[PDB]
Amino acid sequence: ETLRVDPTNDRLSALVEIYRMMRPGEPPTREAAESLFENLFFSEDRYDLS
């Protein structure tokens, strides 16, 4: 059901959705969206489970 409600289909459109939610209104890009998402949880200088 979540994939029913889920409007996006692929990593590009999903990253764009994430970018719109985080940094809203700004026109997204492929590169800016990917960079924001990777800097969310998988860049070592911005996310630390101690």
Place this chain on the structure above:
Amino acid sequence: SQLKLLVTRGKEQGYLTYAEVNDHLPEDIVDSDQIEDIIQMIN
């Protein structure tokens, strides 16, 4: 409609979490001042 749904759902619930307001407030808004004014009016 959206924020109207939020207002009516609140008025039937008697309360509103920050989460529900975030889900219901529009997506064009970027700054926090319009968001806090919306929260003030809605309160």
